[PDB]
Write a protein that binds this ligand. Structure first.
Ligand code: MG
Ligand code: MG
Ligand code: MG
Ligand code: MG
Ligand code: MG
Lengths: 222, 231, 244, 196, 195, 243, 241, 204, 250
């Protein structure tokens, strides 16, 4: 995985590639690594795929129940604290590496959490196998006072560095934008620069090609 | 009356009736006496039988080489409390290489008895105890009652008709307190003290029980022909 | 302490009855009547709803008849909420048996376990018993069609026809009168409704005050089908027997 | 990490680099290793980021609860809470923490807590991988009752050297000044401290 | 332990199970019956870790006998095999797993069919015309692939089994001291005394 | 009614009669006092000599908690010991975690919450003691009194038991005549007097006097018992004032 | 009637133990009052030290729960301190778990839930207290939320509690009819305290020295109580007007 | 001592036009020894189909578990579980055993009864959901299935064509794996008819 | 110490009544009126906001609660009991359903879970029944709109329309006259407002009435965009203003 977070004027943007691997094999070419914790708190995840999904869903659930209990919009620092304490308790055995971001009544926020429970604060962050390719771009092009459109460009450029240069990353770029005073916009497949070329040939077979021994109707009714 | 159903209930005058009823089992107990000088501490106890075919209930229990007690009331409760003391004396030796102070033995018994007077489901102990011992500050006599109150004395007595012995000791105070370096005379003064509580019966050979602890005397118990010397 | 407020739910009277069980049966005796009738080719379950209101949603409603698995159902008389606790237990128990042996649970074995749960509340734990009597209607390949009942005591017995709830005395006399062993399901259906019609405390028996179920071998060859009747289907069967 | 805390005339100053490392990769070049557990009780963190954060978070909770019941805790008390966690969980922690705070009775105080969870009250303390390279320097240049400006200079020069030699240390030099006046945050960028 | 086989023919299941018990360089016993009757029409053979084998077999036996008494009824071979599998499937993630492999041969009286189930210590169940556990199968499966027919008689089954034992006695490195053979059919369970 | 048969039950007034009944056991007990002074506190108590046979000096009733706190109580003695045992656990756990000895207000609330806890349930009985206690912490001297309900406050002087009214009246005078403060050595003598004055309300049996104190100057902030020449000097002062 | 000894329903659907716990609320014979400014929330309570032997500084029914939250209690002190200690622990735990300061209304809800449990579960008695929580919440601004032994809680524009609570309530209702707003339109907390004391005087018909009162003030990011002298300064300014 | 490759086996699933297909081999072995030629790896709960590769004891156990859970679902919900929902239940259930997992590669296939959409999904042993428009692969010949599918597949195949495609993907993947083969089954699934075909394949 | 109350506090009397359930139902009778009406394209639930003081801010007390995005609740009886049930109901929707199936529970099943909690308070040791009746309105894909009543016993019933509390007998009669199977949501809101006026004595405006609907999806209330299948909550609380607009055309 490559994942990033970039702060701008009036909010925060996160992005991620869409490759999932099992060793050198690509299992999923279009998996969603941007996870909704609450409507305006989204989380980019790298590491053990099931772990990032479970830990993000669990804290997402508890944040919802908290928001209801308190009659308040959830804050990023709550998601951060709940995630970090959970991950710390498991001493790294839950392999979730997360960029946590969103907007809440307090402002806009960007954090990262490592699997052992350590947290970071910053204006730009990257995690995953492609984090060095991404960070190289962020360190090259980041500045204070970015516009929304500049931050998206920077973020997706940082993911692209991962897609092209890191074998752990590929396929597409997902983006989510969390601006203050607005609904978060989830931009699924914001970029699709890896469309498969037309195949040279159709492999559709002559019907009857496959040798068959038996048939039978299967009953799916009651 | 309405307030004696359990130990967790105060009466309107601030009394704990179950504790008072526990105290009553002591009064029905056979008499026992304790007294001490500055060198020795002595227990005398009148043992009671069921009838002529029975044994005479043992009333004195050794707790350590330097400590022990006599009982009056429910005997199994004395067994529980004596066993607890045996362990406390034992813990003191194993962990601190230290003979347990008779005063601490008293505080520990008080706190054990007290817990059974403040909780639901339990009951107070139905027994009173006289603890004697010789520790680093000399001879000691202690009186335990199941309310939790423990008291250090030169001498005392508990059980049925204990008021006779307790008056005698109150008179004899200045005499017996100075029976130093003389075991048999301190016992004689306790045997005389217990005799102030006898009625229609006198001290016989399998009726009397005596114990002594002191400077160079391990806590030891005398019954049978070994107490004929004192009748 | 708390001893003062303990009703002691699990004790014997001087006569050797269980107070709480007896008082639970007393509760059940005011519940909507439920009837089970077993035929050679199937089983009927009919039950009367507790005094309905016109504004109740009758078609998406379930008060009396519940599905335990595909081959077993029950009719309830007593506290519905109590019965749902027991129903979910029975449902889970069926699935444990299936999981363990790869065979659907024999009817008696399910009934025994539910009855054993009820018995426990009468002997230990200081809790009130469940205020529920069940009629169990089921099929298995050992005994075929079976009717049972269980009550708060945890006692269970098997029947050809049985009623629980209100007016079981009146109802049992009428079933005893017209029941006969070679009977078919369709005759049994008629008997069930006729019996409710004469025992009901209401002015007249209508579709909206009923729940109805059959367990027939009425699917295709060697297999059993559960039919929980929809409101319109009860309305029709009520006409087809001449009660409306 | 390179970290230190120095008592002086008016109180105490904490200082730290800003580098967090996973191997030779710098995961964060602008880290804040000076952490508030109370208004005027702070700590410098070294070791595992996760461990030291989890610890500071727990301590902050304890001292907030202490404050609600018994009023402001002493720096000794704060150091004792750190120790208790570090000592009792010594098998599962990699945390070298310096505790520093300002009382009005006790003025500036510094307690250091190495890996075992022992406690050591000192005029000043240095810790982290980079500290090894400045034991010589710091022992020769430290004096008691320095002024604020002298202490800031001592820390700036000391951490400059620790950063120069230790590759694990680097970035900016952060400081936190704890006096009767209040709490002051200072920062010093490479272009300044590198050419001292 | 080591050698346990099973063959299902037209009207019976036949289990053959080695007689040797070896600890170290000594054959302690040459007449060991590695089998337990679970019910009148169900027999289980077993092999594996010393002690574990019998302890497991007898535990299953006790459980099935209890069931029989409670219901006054005999569980089908399929039901028994599923109970056994689940017990082993639990065991495999225990602190100390039962290291026992089993064959279950039963005659289902409701279907009038013989049934053979092979289950290893992991709780891996399969129904088979013929089965084996351990190294046995490496010789016998190929041989039964060749000579087995589904419509064979009990006597044809026994001869087919004699071939298997002959091959094992030729090519197996260890002396397993022959086999005890048992037949499970509509009339229950009996032992062939001369083999 | 029957509202008084079970602890933790509110009567229709809003009262817990079982706690009020515990208060009667306290009023039945021997007199005990506490006097706050310039840089410390003084505790005193009346010990009834039931019999010649009680060894003098050797049935000690005042209790130390940690090194710096003294506790005295009137009522059921074992209940008082049980409370001090808990106080000792509470102080140890405070010092273990926070290093500094437990501040006196902090210590007061530990006992307060524990006693109040025994008014929350019907499965326990309220404490049959009122407890006077205190000492010297980093903020100075503190004296407290704690009742069966869990109620406690800070005091200039405090008294409880059979002679509480006599003692209370005597305490109010000292407060009026010494607005700038009382010295520790003074307070020791006054304590002795007030106990002797309060003994009027318990005069069947004669008594043994017991005193203790914490003073920043006289004891270095630690709790010690008053014995020997200082005890006798304060007894004499008290003898001279009843005559 | 054992339905009057524990928290189970009476035939008329009531919980007598809860109702009697409300009556314990007034055992102290103190009245409390809370109002909101623009920037602040003030709470005042009578202070009565009958005994001359008491250290008056240790006599208080106002508690600092957290940096931002204050609580005044109407009811016996042992129950009051029990509630204070719990509320402190709950606010500290909330901060550690969720990363921000516990709001006044959420702590109120949580303490209300705890009280509710004592009304449903038999082994626990209700606390004979009414708890008035005040703060300047970072989202909701000046806030007053009050809890009782029934487990009920609600937010207030202003409120009062005690034996002569009705007199104070109507006094305040009458003011807000006239002002047409939800709060005291006043810049400084000093004048909001002055309002509170003034309207308590009118309602109760009594004058106050500096030791007859006890005052707590909540501002953005701190809640504090007032010294005798801070109050005297405040009393002086009322008289000179 | 790698549990996922002791018994062997494979499962593959594909979408077509208003249809899905799911196929599996029939082998169960103990390493080199082939043992059963009749070990089917595809099960169904109502109209939702589940294939499972990996350790065979867990394959059996999970089938028995999901039958258990879907039966209870149906009794309480009064309707059959849909594939999107079942996929979520599979994920929950595997992640519940996060640190002592079932050693399996499940595959879900089916057609939603309300929307008519075809649906497939795959899972790792720990519950991660791999959703896909085109195909899902699983088992000891998964590399091979990936290679077959990625070249052979095209969208919107009619049921009779999809059958040929999935069968050829399975068969040729199986023949390059020592632990897969020994028979094969293919399920063609349409809105309200399901056809099951056993394939003829090499028996080595 | 510790809970020594391990025995039932609700037991059968000789007549067969369960006293504490009856007495709880009596507490519900004393409670303020609340009601629910089921329309073809929506459900409405409504109640009066009986304020305890006029100094109270009755907006801070919410009698109508969101449980899931498509389910809401209202009650009659003891408010505190209701509040904790809402807390537990919200939580149980997640623990026993959403964390398993990745979707919110359908109305009947969530109701089933709340009923279970209330049945347990009727049998477990050391507790009294809840002193509330709930009305729970909701929508789910396979059952459409639904409305359920839940009583202290734990029993629940589906309703076309009903009312509970103080003026329930009267209001149920009013609803029988006005209800039909062709009601549009707006018609049902109108009927709810009419039915409620009969049982309310004092002021009758959008500040003393609390009223929510289960209707169409509200994408504007979702908080984010980009997932087509997530279309927003069907639960909506009507504003003070929105109620008054409908009280003019009454
Ligand atoms: Mg660690
Ligand atoms: Mg460097
Ligand atoms: Mg209660
Ligand atoms: Mg192959
Ligand atoms: Mg081969």
């Amino acid at each position: 995985t490559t994942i990033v977070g970039v702060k701008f004027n009036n909010g925060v943007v996160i992005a991620a590639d869409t490759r999932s691997t099992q060793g050198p094999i690509v299992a999923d070419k279009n998996c969603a690594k941007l996870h909704r914790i609450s409507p305006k708190i989204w989380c980019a995840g790298a590491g053990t795929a099931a772990d990032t999904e479970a830990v993000t869903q669990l804290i997402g659930s508890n944040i919802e129940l908290h928001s209801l209990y308190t009659s308040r919009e959830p804050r990023v620092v709550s998601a951060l604290q709940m995630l970090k304490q959970h991950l710390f308790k498991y001493q790294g055995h839950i392999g979730a590496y997360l960029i946590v971001a969103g907007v809440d009544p307090t402002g806009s926020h960007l954090f990262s959490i490592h699997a052992d429970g350590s947290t970071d604060v910053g204006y730009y962050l990257s995690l995953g196998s492609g984090s060095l390719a991404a960070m190289a771009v962020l360190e090259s092009h980041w500045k204070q006072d970015l516009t929304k459109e500049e931050a998206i460009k920077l973020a997706s450029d940082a993911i692209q560095a991962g897609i092209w240069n890191d074998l752990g990353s590929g396929s597409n770029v997902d983006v989510c934008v969390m601006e203050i005073g607005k609904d978060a916009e989830y931009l699924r497949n914001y970029l699709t620069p890896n469309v498969r070329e037309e195949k040279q040939k159709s492999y559709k077979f002559p019907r009857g090609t496959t040798a068959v021994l038996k048939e039978s109707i299967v009953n799916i009714c009651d | 009356n309405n307030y004696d159903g359990d130990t967790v209930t105060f009466s309107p005058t601030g009394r704990l009736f179950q504790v008072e009823y526990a105290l009553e089992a002591i009064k029905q107990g056979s008499v026992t006496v304790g007294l001490r000088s500055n060198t020795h501490a002595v227990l005398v106890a009148l043992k009671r039988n069921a009838d002529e075919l029975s044994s005479y209930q043992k009333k004195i229990i050794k707790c350590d080489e330097h400590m022990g007690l006599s009982l009056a009331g429910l005997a199994p409760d004395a067994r529980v409390l004596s066993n607890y003391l045996r362990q406390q004396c034992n813990y003191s030796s194993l962990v601190f290489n230290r003979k347990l102070a008779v005063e601490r033995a008293g505080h520990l018994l008080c706190d054990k008895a007290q817990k059974n007077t403040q909780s639901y489901g339990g009951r107070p102990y139905g027994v009173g105890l006289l603890i004697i011992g010789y520790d680093k500050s000399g001879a000691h006599l202690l009186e335990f009652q199941p309310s939790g109150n423990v008291t250090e004395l030169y001498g005392t007595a508990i059980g049925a008709r204990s008021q006779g012995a307790k008056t005698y000791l109150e008179r004899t105070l200045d005499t017996f307190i100075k029976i130093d370096g003389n075991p048999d005379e301190l016992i004689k003064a306790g045997v005389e003290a217990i005799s102030q509580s006898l009625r229609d019966e006198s001290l016989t050979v399998d009726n009397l029980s005596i114990a002594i602890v002191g400077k160079d005397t391990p806590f030891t118990i005398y019954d049978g022909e070994a107490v004929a010397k004192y009748i | 302490g708390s001893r003062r407020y303990d009703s002691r739910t699990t004790i014997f009277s001087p006569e050797g009855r269980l107070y709480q069980v007896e008082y639970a049966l007393e509760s059940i005796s005011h519940a909507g009547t439920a009837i089970g009738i077993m035929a050679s080719d199937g089983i009927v379950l009919a039950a009367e709803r507790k005094v309905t209101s016109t504004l109740l949603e009758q078609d998406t409603s379930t008060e009396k008849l519940y599905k335990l698995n595909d081959k077993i159902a029950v009719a309830v008389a007593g506290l519905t909420a109590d019965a749902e606790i027991l129903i979910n237990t029975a449902r889970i128990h069926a699935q444990n048996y299936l999981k363990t042996y790869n065979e659907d649970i024999p009817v008696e074995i399910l009934v025994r376990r539910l009855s054993d749960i009820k018995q426990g509340y009468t002997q230990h734990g200081g809790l009130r018993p469940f205020g529920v009597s069940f009629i169990y209607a089921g099929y298995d390949d050992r005994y075929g069609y079976q009717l049972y009942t269980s009550n708060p005591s945890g006692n269970y017995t098997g029947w050809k026809a049985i009623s629980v709830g209100a007016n079981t005395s009146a109802a049992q006399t009428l079933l005893q009168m017209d029941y006969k062993d070679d009977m078919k399901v369709d005759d049994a259906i008629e008997l069930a409704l006729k019996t409710l019609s004469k025992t009901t405390d209401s002015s007249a028996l209508t579709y909206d005050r009923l729940e109805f179920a059959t367990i027939r071998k009425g699917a295709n060859d060697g297999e059993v089908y559960q039919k929980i009747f929809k409101p319109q289907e009860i309305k029709d069967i009520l006409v087809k027997t001449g009660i409306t | 990490t390179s970290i230190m805390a120095v008592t002086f005339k008016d109180g105490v100053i904490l200082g730290a680099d800003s580098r967090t490392t996973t191997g030779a990769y710098i995961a964060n070049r602008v880290t804040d290793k000076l952490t508030r557990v109370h208004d005027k009780i702070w700590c410098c963190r070294s070791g595992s980021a996760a461990d030291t954060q989890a610890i500071a978070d727990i301590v902050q909770y304890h001292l907030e609860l202490y404050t609600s019941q018994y009023g402001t805790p002493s720096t000794e008390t704060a150091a004792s809470v750190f120790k208790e966690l570090c000592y009792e969980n010594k098998d599962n922690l990699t945390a070298g923490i310096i505790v520093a705070g300002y009382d009005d009775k006790n003025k500036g105080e510094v307690y250091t807590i190495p890996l075992g969870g022992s406690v050591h009250k000192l005029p000043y303390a240095i810790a982290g991988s980079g500290s090894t390279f400045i034991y010589g320097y710091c022992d020769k240049n430290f004096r008691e009752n320095m002024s604020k400006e002298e202490t800031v200079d001592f820390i700036k020069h000391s951490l400059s050297q620790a950063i120069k030699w230790d590759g694990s240390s680097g970035g900016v030099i952060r400081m936190v000044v704890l006096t009767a006046a209040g709490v002051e945050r200072l920062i010093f960028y490479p272009d300044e401290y590198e050419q001292l | 332990m080591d050698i346990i086989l099973g063959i299902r023919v037209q009207d019976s299941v036949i289990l053959a199970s080695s007689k040797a018990v070896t600890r170290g360089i000594s054959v302690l016993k040459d007449s060991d019956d590695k089998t337990r009757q679970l019910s009148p029409h169900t027999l289980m053979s077993f092999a594996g870790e010393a002690g574990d084998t019998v302890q497991f077999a007898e535990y299953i036996q006790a459980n099935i006998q209890l069931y029989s008494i409670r219901e006054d009824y005999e569980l089908s071979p399929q039901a028994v095999s599923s109970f056994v599998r689940q017990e082993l499937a639990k065991s495999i993630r225990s602190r100390r797993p039962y290291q026992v492999n089993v064959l279950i041969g039963g005659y289902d009286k409701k279907k009038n069919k013989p049934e053979l189930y092979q289950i290893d210590y992991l709780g891996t169940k399969v129904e088979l015309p013929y089965g084996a556990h351990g190294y046995s199968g490496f010789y016998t499966f190929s041989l039964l692939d060749h000579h087995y027919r589904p419509d064979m008689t009990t006597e044809e089954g026994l001869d087919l089994l004699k071939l298997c034992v002959q091959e094992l006695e030729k090519r197996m490195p260890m002396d397993f001291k022959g086999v005890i053979v048992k037949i499970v059919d509509k009339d229950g369970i009996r032992q062939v005394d001369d083999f | 009614t029957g509202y008084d048969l079970s602890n933790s039950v509110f009567s229709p007034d809003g009262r817990n009669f079982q706690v009020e009944y515990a208060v009667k056991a306290v009023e039945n007990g021997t007199t005990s006092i506490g006097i706050k002074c310039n840089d410390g506190v003084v505790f005193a108590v009346e010990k009834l000599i039931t019999s010649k046979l009680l060894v003098p000096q050797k049935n000690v009733k005042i209790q130390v908690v940690d090194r710096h706190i003294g506790c005295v109580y009137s009522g059921l003695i074992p209940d008082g010991r049980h409370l001090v045992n808990r106080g000792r656990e509470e102080a140890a756990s405070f010092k273990k975690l926070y290093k500094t000895p437990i501040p006196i207000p902090a210590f007061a609330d530990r006992l307060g919450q524990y006693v109040q806890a025994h008014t929350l349930y019907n499965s326990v009985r309220p404490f049959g003691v009122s407890t006077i206690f205190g000492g010297v912490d980093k903020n100075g001297a503190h004296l407290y009194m704690l009742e069966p309900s869990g109620s406690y406050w800070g005091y200039k002087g405090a008294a409880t038991g059979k002679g509480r009214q006599s003692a209370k009246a005597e305490l109010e005078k000292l407060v009026d005549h010494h607005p700038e403060g009382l010295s520790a050595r003074e307070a020791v003598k006054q304590a002795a007097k007030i106990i002797y004055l309060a003994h009027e309300d318990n005069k069947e049996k004669d008594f043994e006097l017991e005193i203790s104190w914490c003073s920043l100057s006289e004891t270095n902030g630690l709790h010690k018992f008053v014995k020997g020449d200082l005890l006798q000097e304060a007894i004499d002062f008290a003898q001279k004032e009843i005559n | 009637g054992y339905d009057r000894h524990i928290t189970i329903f009476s035939p008329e659907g009531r919980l007598y133990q809860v109702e009697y716990a409300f009556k314990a609320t007034n055992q102290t014979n103190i009245n409390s009052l809370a109002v909101r400014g623009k920037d602040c929330t003030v709470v005042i309570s009578q202070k009565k030290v009958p005994d001359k032997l008491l250290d008056p500084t240790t006599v208080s029914y106002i508690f600092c729960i957290s940096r931002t939250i204050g609580m005044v209690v109407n009811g016996p002190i042992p129950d009051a301190r029990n509630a204070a200690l719990r509320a402190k622990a709950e606010a500290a735990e909330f901060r550690y778990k969720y990363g921000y300061d516990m709001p006044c209304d959420v702590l109120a809800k949580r303490m209300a839930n705890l009280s509710q449990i004592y009304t449903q579960r038999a082994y626990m008695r209700p606390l004979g207290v009414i708890l008035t929580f005040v703060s300047v919440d970072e989202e909701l601004g000046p806030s007053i939320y009050k809890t009782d032994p029934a487990g009920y809680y609600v937010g207030y524009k202003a409120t009062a509690t005690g034996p002569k609570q009705q007199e104070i309530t109507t006094n305040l209702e009458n003011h807000f009819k006239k002002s047409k707003i939800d709060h005291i339109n006043e810049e400084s907390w000093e004048k909001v305290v002055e309002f509170a004391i003034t309207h308590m005087i009118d309602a109760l018909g009594t004058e106050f020295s500096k030791n007859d009162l006890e005052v707590g003030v909540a501002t953005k990011d701190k809640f504090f109580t007032l010294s005798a002298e801070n109050i005297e300064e405040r009393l002086v300014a009322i008289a000179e007007q | 001592s790698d549990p996922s490759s002791i018994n062997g086996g494979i499962v593959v699933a594909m979408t077509g036009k208003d249809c899905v297909a799911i196929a599996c081999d029939l082998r169960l072995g103990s390493q080199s020894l082939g043992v059963s030629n009749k070990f089917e790896k595809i099960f169904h709960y109502g109209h939702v189909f589940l294939g499972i590769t990996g350790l065979a004891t867990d394959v059996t156990t999970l089938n028995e578990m999901f039958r258990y859970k879907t039966n209870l679902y149906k009794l309480k919900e009064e309707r059959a579980i849909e594939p999107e929902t079942f996929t979520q239940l599979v994920s929950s259930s595997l992640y519940e055993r996060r640190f002592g997992p079932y050693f399996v590669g499940p595959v879900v296939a089916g057609i939603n009864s309300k929307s008519g959409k075809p649906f497939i999904a795959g899972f790792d042993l720990i519950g991660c959901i791999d959703e896909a428009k085109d195909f899902i692969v699983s088992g000891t010949a998964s590399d091979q299935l990936f290679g077959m599918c990625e070249s052979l597949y095209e969208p919107n195949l009619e049921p009779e064509d999809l059958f040929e495609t999935i069968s050829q993907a399975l068969l040729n993947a199986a023949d390059r794996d020592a632990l897969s083969g020994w028979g094969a089954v293919v399920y063609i699934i349409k809105k309200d008819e399901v056809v099951k075909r056993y394939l003829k394949m090499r028996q080595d | 110490m510790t809970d020594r109350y391990s025995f039932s506090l609700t037991t059968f009397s000789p007549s067969g009544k369960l006293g504490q359930i009856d007495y709880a139902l009596t507490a519900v009778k004393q409670g303020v009126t609340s009601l629910g009406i089921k329309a073809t394209n929506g459900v409405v639930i409504a109640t009066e906001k009986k304020s305890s003081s006029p100094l109270a801010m009755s907006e801070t007390l919410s009698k109508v609660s969101l449980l899931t995005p498509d389910i809401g609740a209202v009650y009659s009886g003891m408010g505190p009991d209701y509040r904790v049930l809402v807390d537990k109901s919200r939580k149980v929707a997640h623990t026993s359903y959403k964390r398993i199936y990745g979707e919110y529970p359908p109305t009947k099943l969530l109701v089933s879970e709340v009923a279970k909690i209330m049945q347990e308070a009727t049998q477990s040791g050391g507790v009294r029944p809840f002193g509330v009746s709930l009305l729970i309105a909701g929508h789910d894909e396979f059952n459409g709109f639904s409305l359920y009543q839940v009583d202290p016993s734990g029993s629940y019933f589906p309703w076309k329309a009903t009312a509970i509390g103080k003026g329930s007998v009267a209001a149920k009669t009013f609803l029988e006259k006005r209800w039909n199977d062709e009601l549009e949501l707006e018609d049902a809101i109108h009927i709810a407002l009419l039915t409620l006026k009969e049982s309310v004595e004092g002021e009758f405006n959008g500040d003393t009435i609390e009223l929510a609907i289960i209707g169409d999806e509200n994408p504007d209330l979702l908080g984010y965009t980009g997932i087509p299948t997530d279309k927003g909550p069907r639960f909506r609380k009507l504003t003070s203003q929105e109620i008054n607009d409908r009280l003019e055309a009454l």
